[PDB]
């Protein structure tokens, strides 16, 4: 994930509601499981994508937490 | 064998000093010490039972401060005490110290 993609992901995440952020985290966690399954059968040469998704999820939960603190 | 709830008098450590011989004041050679060993002096603790706001209250107090319990009872007459437990009555009396 490039910096520009990270900035853009944060901007778009900060426009979603808590309910929308939760559905998206849930979708990305199933995406992360699918990456796991492909990794375990040696079919994921682009292994950087596992780190990328996990930090995407972290960023989403961080914004989810922002919206719920106040 | 403990602590006076009124004065705070507490067991202290004192030496027991065994002496021999005639004192110099009586024309003797002088007193010699055949032993010094630690011991404890206790407060003269006794029980003082007393009725305050219809409830029996018990104090463990050095005999020297027995009258101080009754003073606390006298001063207790000006207190909103009825309906309370013995533990709670006791705390009030002691607060007037």
């Amino acid at each position: 994930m490039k910096l520009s993609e990270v900035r853009k992901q944060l901007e778009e995440a900060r426009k979603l509601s808590p309910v929308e952020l939760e559905k998206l985290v849930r979708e990305k966690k199933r995406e992360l499981m699918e990456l796991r399954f492909q990794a375990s059968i040696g079919q994921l040469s682009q292994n950087h994508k596992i780190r990328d998704l996990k930090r995407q999820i972290a960023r989403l939960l961080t914004v989810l937490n922002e919206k719920r603190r106040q | 064998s403990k602590v006076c709830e009124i004065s705070g008098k507490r067991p202290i450590v004192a030496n027991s000093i065994q002496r021999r011989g005639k004192a110099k004041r009586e024309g003797g050679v002088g007193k010699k010490t055949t032993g010094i060993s630690k011991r404890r002096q206790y407060p003269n603790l006794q029980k003082v039972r007393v009725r305050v706001a219809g409830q029996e209250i018990t104090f463990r107090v050095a005999a020297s401060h027995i009258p101080k319990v009754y003073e606390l009872v006298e001063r207790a007459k000006g207190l909103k005490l009825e309906g309370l437990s013995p533990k709670e009555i006791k705390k009030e009396l002691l607060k007037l110290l």
């Binding site: 939760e22 849930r26 992360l32 796991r36 375990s40 059968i41 | -």
Partner: protein, 95 residues
């Protein structure tokens, strides 16, 4: 946030685990803390099936060394889930 995809980590890749597909028993690595009841729900909402039986066993990590450094592989937990008659989990049918 806790989801079905935090409970189901990876499939178990072995001859013994593959032997179970032919009768609807699929074997996963599950989170060591995960309960049979929550593994049931996790499998069902991930793979769109009905679970009628769950077996679990802890798999202790193997002690291993690299030179002078003795260590341990992480502990793990296996779940065998039985799916309703006629159902299948195509992701594992794989093979």
């Amino acid at each position: 946030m806790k989801t079905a995809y935090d409970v189901i980590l990876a499939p178990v890749l072995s001859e013994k685990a593959y032997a179970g597909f032919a009768e609807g028993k699929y074997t996963f690595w599950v989170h060591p803390k995960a309960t049979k009841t929550e593994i049931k729900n996790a499998v069902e909402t991930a793979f769109k099936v009905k679970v009628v039986k769950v077996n679990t066993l802890h798999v202790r990590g193997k002690k291993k060394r690299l030179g002078r450094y003795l260590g341990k592989r992480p502990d793990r937990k296996k779940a065998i889930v039985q799916v309703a008659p006629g159902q299948k989990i195509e992701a594992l049918e794989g093979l």
